[PDB]
From a paper:
The combined data indicate that 7947882 and 7904688 are prodrugs activated by the EthA monooxygenase, which then target PyrG, a cytidine triphosphate (CTP) synthetase catalyzing the ATP-dependent amination of uridine triphosphate (UTP) to form the essential pyrimidine nucleotide CTP. The crystal structure of PyrG was solved by molecular replacement on a 2.0-Å resolution data set. This structure showed a bidomain enzyme with an N-terminal amidoligase (ALase) domain, also commonly known as the synthetase domain (residues 1–278), connected through an interdomain linker (residues 279–Pro298) to a C-terminal glutamine amidotransferase (GATase) domain (residues 299–552), both domains displaying a Rossmann-like fold. On the other hand, the 34-residue C-terminal extension of M. tuberculosis PyrG, which has no predicted secondary structure or known function, could not be traced due to the lack of supporting electron density, suggesting a high degree of flexibility.
The enzyme, in complex with either UTP, at 2.0-Å resolution, or UTP plus the non-hydrolyzable ATP analog AMP-PCP and the glutamine analog 5-oxo-L-norleucine (3.5 Å), is a homotetramer with crystallographic 222 symmetry, consistent with previous studies reporting positive cooperativity for ATP and UTP due to nucleotide-driven tetramerization. Also, consistent with the oligomeric assembly as a dimer of dimers being triggered by ATP/UTP, the nucleotide-binding pockets were delimited by residues from two (ATP) or three (UTP) different subunits. Surprisingly, in the highest-resolution structure available, UTP was found lying in both pockets, a likely artifact due to the high concentration of the nucleotide (5 mM) in the co-crystallization conditions. It should be noted that the UTP orientation in the substrate-binding pocket is unproductive for the course of the reaction, as the pyrimidine ring points away from ATP.
Residue numbers in the entry:
A (entry chain A), B (entry chain A), C (entry chain A): 5 to 429, 443 to 552
Write the structure that this text describes.
């Protein structure tokens, strides 16, 4: 029989930006490779109910789950390292917790009580942590739930989360709950020494709020010597086997090997009394060979509205690299500001030396003339094109304009357009997984190797069906639709006209994993390798 | 010219229930008696947006301000000690702050930002503290704003409030901001010693979150000796003149004298560089003579739905005592459960030895047959009656039933009544101050000594005007109405039928002060003294 | 009239090794250059009563003051940056404080009291801090006492010192006491960001023990941007003018310019209400030109017993560089292990490419055959030699052996020597300043430009006077003695035999300053420049 679901909390000390999320994901990968059913959850101390109101060009992309929740980009790291679909419950924010509790209070659901941080707010957080241990849709209960606590220990914002995690430990006991604390071991260049004092003080602050760490992640720019690990084991009263030297890794994919060398995952398995099995390194060693030993390089333009923050297109960038890994190729991303591609000379200067053009999503942006300009250039140049959501819409708009509908546009970007080739169906916001049926022998069906697929959506604008016959005059095919045929889901040009020009209303990058590249990104990068070889 | 408005923060350490609110109010009284314009504010760390969802029979009454806000009962203590009307802004809750910030976030008012505890929550609290320093309706800016911080220092719930108060100090400087910290000095009976260690540790916790106390309130069951005050001055680094021995007082009205003997108010005035003037003791010494030296006693029944928690009727109980003070009388409150007054024998057992019957408000209660039974008994017995809100409604229902409308009731308590003598005008919830016009020479006009008054309301049910002629058959007079005459505001019987049976739709107790008794409570207690003398 | 002596406490947070001592010294230099009388003191939390029991080859040199106290090497940094003689009271250790208090307790001096950390230990520390504000021998009372608190805030070992400093502030008031806190602002290379969180948490720990910092030293590997300084000013509630970006400097002599650019010294002067005067940069700008713009280079061997820790010979190394500065020369120190110089081929390999040989002191070492070997090589080679304490003794031993006393030695290193040319006078340990009278026209009198000098000693072995005539057969002159002529203080060879071979029983390096090079080191480096030019 399966033992109780274990809870492993990941907290951070000293300072943020130490990479707690990627350490947690890498531990999730190691435990998954040991045959454990691992799920992950992020507690975000921000008040935004969902990250949809945040500027993604400052704060990073919005990740969308199968069930349609808009979440912190960390859920994307979890899905990529676990190769698993996570529920919307995998991202809890202070905003969610407080508005749920306040809304219940206003309805009289606390029956005359004074509604308090303890127990009402901490009960809500605890409820959301414990919900992760419920059996999934297939009927499976996880072995381990890894919960990452955002914010830094000693700060005000994470106090209700840390209190809830302390109560989870109190109610489930030490056998079912593990605390992993991430700290910084700074190097002082004038004296040449590494310092353990910040970890010593951070662990005392963690202990002061009632939490005893079982293990410590020592984030450092170099190996932490055994003498320093011994000092930390003694001063922080942590088993020496739980004191983990975690030096900065060359790639994010190398972090599981760093943690495994320090035997963190074997310590976790023994401490939580989990079924023991050796790590099966087959899948991850294969990824690492594709990461560190590519056989060729290919340049891809990512034509984003704003490209100074790569995290705004993190899942797209990861899906492009994963497409490369499948071909044993290194994808070099050429970050191109879409505003520079509006004119033919601007698009030529920006895209003249690339091998493929990716037009990503642009939820909430204004001004798409640069994205349309990039597609017009790529079509004339013979460059492969992959359009995602706004990308498909731009492929459809450019096709309509190429056949005489000069002022064709989306009613989203030009409400006064005489030809709204993209329009609402107010309409309906489509979030999360939606099924699509593909034309057999189409470019998209050949890429997927099936005619029945599902992809995640985040949009309310659709191809206007009144324009299908007029748009098709360009040779553009509506090669994928909703099962009833009403909604256009995929577009493509015939391969005799353009070897690879594909659009999707969805975000296939979200279902990409470094160990499981998405079929559309594999076909796109493959077409980019073909273009390079032809040139 | 008037100097900058000063902010005086009152925090609590060691444990709650030490009486921070009454200490703050008493300091507000002392500063007011020095001719300073003082306003007060309570920061409540509970999530209830307003205390309307709290059971008042567990948590205490809801106070209503002139502008119609439903607030914590502490605002009532502030109004009573300051003799001033406070704005709805005088009560800030965590619930208010978080729902305001989350609602702004959902509307996109933070323009793409990550919404955080610091600065977004603390900016909202700071905004609400600084709003208290704005000029009032008459154009006057306060000299001092006393802000009471609910919760205890070292607890999670008060951390955003304490951080906001620390930022107020940072931005206004030490000259305009004063920190008063309330602590416990426990007595250990086996060793016979008072202990300063809890104050020492509480002040270190206060300092740890960035606040330096200017003065300390040492709450104790006896005088704190000079040697202990010297130890605290040294260990807490507080001026000895700011170390205040605050032993438990015999009455709440004695606390200003306790603080004045220790010269706390003179220390505050000097430390904040406020205009100096001696306390004018005329008004408070007069109150203390009425408190400690009554010339007679009078027994009043307070016929409440639930009477085990006196704080559920705090403003009523204070208004009854203030009515007594005006007559140099001691009002002994006989707390009577209304459910025991439904039958004539039950009402006789409960009210047979009282001199007056007060029927208070009952916002949100169910089952008023006991309150109607108490009025029927009091009318037959010749007992004075004062009804407040639900009290007037019960006087009107009992009058209607005494003239043949056997099933007369409020549609609130019996929706199926064939005679809804009390009904909505859904209707309109009337909150805060409303003007009333009184019949000249009526009992109510003679009590007020004017025909034009205003009182605070908290109700949506009104006297049904279709029943005025039928109800008047009992001899009941509609002696007070809204200015247009549409809404019944006051009822009374003629003095030749009952010497004092008065109802009001409002809560006059809220406008009562111990130094300014409300005219209706003065007339009611006076009628109770008359009944006692006649018996 | 002179205002009250000010106390400026320097504490450290986050981690040790940030350079608190050199920051404090540099501030002492800036205040001295403003015409203020500044004195400095180090509080060391170690239990060693004096650093004499510490291995200097692990922990650094022992500094000796004029009054003969053996102190932490930090006193040497203070003397060098202030150009002032400090009393033995300038170094307080936990060992000193506890043994003084325990010794008084054992004698019954606390008259029946329970002897406690507070107040008995903290009174002793406070006494030692306040003693620094007493008028000196010349009758002058300092303007400022800078007290450096060793250990890190949040650690156990510095708690009594920090408590004493908090009591100094309590008793003298905020006008006479200033707190400077040194913190670390680490850089995280993967994200490219500087982090203020460790300073935020360190200042909260400092505040928690009752201390409010007036200013912060932000130790960093680069400039701290204004946005981070603004964040720290707000979160730590420190005046923005007191938030000091202190990036790692190229030389220790550049730190005053770093602090002056951030206007720390002008902030200190204004905050403590000290007489204001601009920094006179004449002397320090002159030093910086000699530091950064040398006209030539000269190589000097420092023939130490153990040379892997340069701090074991810090004052010697600084005196050598200061000798270089006087000649506008860069002294390159060739760290030579003395054990490798015992044989003529070993000494040739080690000293063949140098321009001068310095034989430093060796209090407590064993095995001096390598130092004697280095002197024998340097004499034959024509290399300049400067011997300090053990160095003079080695010059005397080598001279005695060169004239037939083959087994000549010190009774310290060979008790069985038939010729103890160096011996005790048990004897008398000579510590601190001793006067010497110099032979007019001798090498040493020409270097000093006077025949009457004083130097600091740390030794009990002396030249055995029974051997003066025999040693003089080598041509060695006893060119300096005690005033009564009994003790040999200086030795030298005639310039016609060796241009510069000088020994001193004292430690002249201790009286060296970078702005005031010692005459013997100036003459030694000058002789090394002469040797280089001749080669
Ligand atoms: O264990 C780790 C984690 C992270 N990293 C390195 O740090 C980089 C940043 O890692 P993250 O993307 O996880 O940083 P973050 O700002 O989200 O950190 P938190 O506040 O969540 O703690 C990564 O891209 C990688 O280069 C490591 O080398 N090792
Ligand atoms: O909680 C503690 C830990 C240590 N100490 C004291 O710290 C002193 C050593 O001071 P360090 O700064 O060298 O600390 P560390 O070695 O523990 O840490 P890192 O260098 O790795 O940053 C020792 O003299 C010990 O008494 C405390 O006083 N309290
Ligand atoms: O300074 C004071 C305050 C209070 N008291 C006595 O304490 C009683 C309770 O005083 P409170 O009604 O103010 O208690 P509380 O529970 O609201 O306390 P906080 O959490 O707000 O701190 C009062 O009725 C009076 O008897 C004093 O004697 N002196
Ligand atoms: O660490 C904590 C514990 C509790 N609380 C908050 O304390 C509030 C209750 O405040 P109390 O003063 O009543 O505390 P208590 O019941 O825990 O202790 P005693 O009366 O027995 O002295 C609750 O509203 C809860 O949110 C914190 O904010 N932080
Ligand atoms: O303000 C400063 C102080 C120091 N330093 C640089 O740091 C080096 C080490 O400076 P220290 O010799 O003062 O380090 P430390 O180990 O004694 O530190 P504490 O525990 O006393 O705090 C110095 O030689 C210089 O290179 C700076 O650049 N700036
Ligand atoms: O005491 C505090 C300070 C700040 N915060 C919270 O810290 C969050 C920002 O988290 P950071 O890690 O970015 O902190 P910082 O900007 O203050 O410091 P550095 O990056 O310079 O190291 C904000 O969301 C704020 O609510 C606390 O909760 N408590
Ligand atoms: Mg992260
Ligand atoms: Mg150390
Ligand atoms: Mg209270
Ligand atoms: Mg005691
Ligand atoms: Mg130092
Ligand atoms: Mg930050």
């Amino acid at each position: 029989p399966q033992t109780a679901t274990k809870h492993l909390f990941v907290s951070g000390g000293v300072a943020s930006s130490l990479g707690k999320g990627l350490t947690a994901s890498s531990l999730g990968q190691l435990l998954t490779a040991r045959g454990l059913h691992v799920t992950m959850q992020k507690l975000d101390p921000y008040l935004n109910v969902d990250p949809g109101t945040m500027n993604p060009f400052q704060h990073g992309e919005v990740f969308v789950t199968e069930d349609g929740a808009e979440t912190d980009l960390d859920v994307g790291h979890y899905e990529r390292f676990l190769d698993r679909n996570l529920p919307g419950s995998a991202n809890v924010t202070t905003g969610q917790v407080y508005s749920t509790v306040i809304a219940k209070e206003r309805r009289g659901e606390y029956l005359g009580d004074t509604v308090q941080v303890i127990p009402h707010i901490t009960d809500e957080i605890k409820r959301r942590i414990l919900a992760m241990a419920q059996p999934d849709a297939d009927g499976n209960r996880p072995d381990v739930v890894i919960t990452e606590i955002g914010g830094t220990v000693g700060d005000i914002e994470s106090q209700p989360f840390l209190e809830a995690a302390r109560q989870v430990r109190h109610y489930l006991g030490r056998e079912d709950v593990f605390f992993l604390h991430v700290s910084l071991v700074p190097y002082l260049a004038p004296s040449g020494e590494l310092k353990t004092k910040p970890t010593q003080h951070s662990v005392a602050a963690l202990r002061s709020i009632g939490i005893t760490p079982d293990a410590l992640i020592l984030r450092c720019d170099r190996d932490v010597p055994e003498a320093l690990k011994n000092k930390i084991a003694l001063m922080c009263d942590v088993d020496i086997d739980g004191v983990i030297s975690t030096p900065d890794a060359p790639s994010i994919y190398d972090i599981p090997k760093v943690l495994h060398r320090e035997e963190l995952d074997a310590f976790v398995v023994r401490r939580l009394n989990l079924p023991f099995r050796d790590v099966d390194w087959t899948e991850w060693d294969d990824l690492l060979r594709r990461v560190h030993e590519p056989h060729e390089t290919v340049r891809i333009a990512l034509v984003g509205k704003y490209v100074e923050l790569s995290d705004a297109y993190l899942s797209v960038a990861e899906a492009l690299r994963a497409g490369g890994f499948k071909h044993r190729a290194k994808v070099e991303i050429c970050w191109v500001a879409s505003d520079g591609c509006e004119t033919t000379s601007g698009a030529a200067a920006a895209l003249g030396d690339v091998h493929g053009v990716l037009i990503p999503g642009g939820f909430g942006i204004r001004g798409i003339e640069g994205k349309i300009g990039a597609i017009a250039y790529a079509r004339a140049r013979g460059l492969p094109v992959l359009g995602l959501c706004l990308g498909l819409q731009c492929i459809v708009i450019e096709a309509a304009r190429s056949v005489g509908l000069t002022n064709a546009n989306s009613a989203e970007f030009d409400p006064d357009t005489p030809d709204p080739v993209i329009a609402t169906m107010g309409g309906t916001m489509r979030l999360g997984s939606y099924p699509a049926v593909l034309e057999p022998d189409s470019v998209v069906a050949q890429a997927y190797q099936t005619t029945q697929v599902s992809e995640r959506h985040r949009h309310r604008y659709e191809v206007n069906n009144a324009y299908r016959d007029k748009i098709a005059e360009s040779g553009l095919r509506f090669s994928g639709t909703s099962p009833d045929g009403h909604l256009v889901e995929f577009v493509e040009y015939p391969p005799d006209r353009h070897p690879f020009v594909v659009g999707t209303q969805a975000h296939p990058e979200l279902k990409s994993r470094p160990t499981r590249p998405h079929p559309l990104f594999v076909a796109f990068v493959g077409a980019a390798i073909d273009y390079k070889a032809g040139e």
